[model samples]
Target: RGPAIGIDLGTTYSCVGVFQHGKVEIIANDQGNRTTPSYVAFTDTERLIGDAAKNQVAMNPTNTIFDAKRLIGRKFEDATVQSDMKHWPFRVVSEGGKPKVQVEYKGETKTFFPEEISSMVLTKMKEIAEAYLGGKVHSAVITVPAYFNDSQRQATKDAGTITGLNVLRIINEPTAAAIAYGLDKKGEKNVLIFDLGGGTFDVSILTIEDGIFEVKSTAGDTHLGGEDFDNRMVSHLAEEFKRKHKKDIGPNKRAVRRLRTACERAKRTLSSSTQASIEIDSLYEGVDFYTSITRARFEELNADLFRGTLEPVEKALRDAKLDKGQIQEIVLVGGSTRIPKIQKLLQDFFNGKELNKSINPDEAVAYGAAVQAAILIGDK
Candidate 1:
């Protein structure tokens, strides 16, 4: 009855928040980071979570589970799931009627279900909240992608159960972002939420008045997100490495890791600056390589990805039966929206209306979850 917590269980990162002392504070994990990497790794005698697990991905790509969100509650026979499984670097096997990822570490092999992997990350977040609030947390409101089917939603609830937390409700991710921004506003307005996260893209249209928020519609591509951008960059970097060293680095584990790191860094850098440089050490036999990329060039390479985002935006508008002129505000959520090109495209699509980025894109969903937690527990 004290304070209820809320969780934004994302594909690449996870965040937890709690209503406290008249405000919602997102609880930082053990690493003092708001977002914990949604990854898991099992060794001979222990399990690793968050950044530690993500760090092991390069050396043990086949063992580390990073994008399990795409597989949660999906059967091995599901077409989308099977297609993704083929491209994933890790090993996914079925066990006892459920699909699980298997990994070998420290001379021993271990297996984990997607829900189990999610629970480990959730447990870590719970620990952080317990430390911050000095009490036990038993209930929470967890947010998921709006387009997620019933099975996926049920799988998320199962993950909470595995972590021993009572899930009050499964709110849509875009709605959560809207609640974080809309609940306190004084006037009625039509808003659009553009949420481009690590593993999914969601656009939601909503009408907010007083403390009530009504979701008009939501649309997105579950297969699109930051991961695809990383993959494209990886492909580009691999070609560059091959050209310079006359040897292909794509098949080399260490080389692939180095290239992936460089690609991720380049993508982040391109967000704020016009150009960014990528450097790889030991990319090939006695060869290190450096390359610079302009933001315009990066955008050109990702033009298709950017165009893909627009489809959902348009879909949301059509679903809501609203035109650009009818929309009162545009709110940006998700870390990928930080890219200037994305911002400009959104602005243009919205008829030159400036996007409201006043809220922290990465933390908005968690903050909204915390607000919902407060409301659910009668703290608001």
Candidate 2:
């Protein structure tokens, strides 16, 4: 039998996993990273995906496509899509009421549907899995956000098919996380999943008993996640730079691009360290920018954004008709949950309950999906 892969098709990054030798293994891309940036760049000569695509983003902002997940399966006139367009350098146009991106490829003007762009990323994921397995991989179980509608879910399956994959199932992201956590291994109990990734947030309350996992309720803010937190820091640094250099860099795409990367790195560092410093050379108009942020300051800067996550947790609990006490374990998903402030807030809210952090945030969803794939193939 051919091995099937599970894919966490995310908004910011994508990961692949497979159930092998009675265990789930996260496949590493050629770059050696377990996860790859969901970016695709088009140059005059050739196209690039993953790390190469992200590395050359500043130079090819107009032709590089990132965050296509937000636009896929949505109309160009969607309010959130329009608002997000303000922050993107690439151009989006409407064709037959569907969203499409325009860019220069191979020295000519070209257009692509969001689904098409997503398929490119999926294709890359399939290739990585195939290379690791040393054989062809066709069947897959892909994970998507819990709130994705029928159209969005269908669009995702379409993207997978476009990559020549037999998409076995499209599962909710939180459900995949629960599967990875194996909450059903114990007995009848309720668990809460808090997922805050680079581009989206979701909370789900689930009941697991007799090896059956049922989602009671789900809630989240599609636009709130790690990238939003990074934006908060980026905006703070950009304003500080404007104040000190007496220059505004908002109009400079390259400068903003460089600053975004630095801010993201610093944001990740703050998760482990009390403070992190950012240094960018020749940021704008031949000037260097240097700054440092303490954890306290970082918390203060995005205090509201951090608090914004709790409302969904409360809402999911309320919708599930369960008190915080009934929830036996609170599972943390997504890399953004590494922030101490977020954990502290959640712990305090639950009266000092220790949150579960055993699973790898980046690969949990993919691992769960892979487990499902193994189950499906075994059934046949």
Candidate 3:
């Protein structure tokens, strides 16, 4: 192998990592960000991915494709796909029972399969890895949700192939987190992995002993995650705008798109502070939109959704035939896990147990993939 890397092919953001200098180090993209937005866009002159693509979404809503992870390997008629498409500004049409994303690029209409769109993100990750390592990267271990089916898995692998990477393995997201957590720790323990990312939620119970990780149970909802939280905030902001200005932003695709980004930022801020505010100039019909949400209000707005996350946790525990007492560690993974209310709920569920926040929620999956990459390459 020339060089091997680990890729966390996430729904909202993606990251790449390599085991180097006796440690697992995440490789930053050319834009200096360790994680890149999982977005692909087409402009009049060129195609864009990551930050550039996301930055242009407000201007080119119909050409910037995002959340492709939710559509890969699925039929066009899937209920979830239909529901998701309703919110996306880009067009998706059924072709031979499969979904095709339609966008305008280089002054021509281009249609792509979800797998192809995902491949572009993977290609970017490969480029980042190759650049950081100063060599051609040959192989990788990619992480996906544990509940992904055979078709989804194969589609993901196909995307990897399109990226020119020899797909060494497609591990479960939580398992990857566990691998990263267990790398240097010597222990026999029962662990619960709660991963809530931008577009999905997964809970898994596992036992790590003697360097082996055995998964006891896995459960999750593909439709629930950080995006839903952002949607909730967006809804609140939109309604407030309507009330305050007598303007409906819902019908304006670009306005809704801009609101989504602002809501996401506010959500991120609420994770660390008591309150967060969103301000958009000319948000709708030249009317500025300004709103602030308290951490409590954010939690309340999505209170039902947040509380619902615990169901999968309880179900996974039940399916594993384990009690709360047996779960020695509750490991949090994914960007959504950064939310304070989620952390508090998880802590309360485990009976005041101190949850493990040692690993970076955003990078752990890729870091674990890097560790596995090292193992595959026969690194000691």
Q: Assess every candidate by TM-score.
A: 0.88, 0.90, 0.88
- Of the two candidates 2 and 3, the one with more favorable lDDT, higher being better, is 2
Which residue pairs in model 2 clash with each other? Answer: none
The segments of candidate 2 whose C-alpha lies over 4 angstroms from its true place after superposition are 75-87, 235-253, 284-291
Q: Candidate 3 on 1-380: residue-level lDDT in tens?
A: 65658999988799999988678989888889989999999999999999889877778889998888889989999998999998888999988999989999899988999999999999989888888888688899998877779899999999999988899899887878888876326466888999888777889988888777778999888778888899998898899999999999898888998899999999999999999989899997789988788998899999999989999988998999998889888888988899999998989888899987888898989988999888888763
CA displacement after TM-score superposition, residue 208 of candidate 1 (Å): 3.4
Assess candidate 2 and give its TM-score to the true structure. Answer: 0.90
Q: How many backbone clashes does candidate 2 have?
A: 0
Best by lDDT: 2
lDDT ranking from best to worst?
2, 3, 1
Across residues 1-380, which tens digit of lDDT does each residue of candidate 2 receive? Answer: 36958999888799999998888999999989999999999999998999889888877889999999998889889998899999889999989999899999999999899889999999999999988989799789999877789889999999999999888899988778888877656568888989888877889998888977788999988777787788888788889999999989989877887888898899899999999999999999899998898888889889999987899999999999998889998889899999999999999999999998877888889988998888888832
Clashing pairs in 3: none
Q: After superposition, how far is residue 22 of candidate 3 from its true place, in Å?
A: 1.2
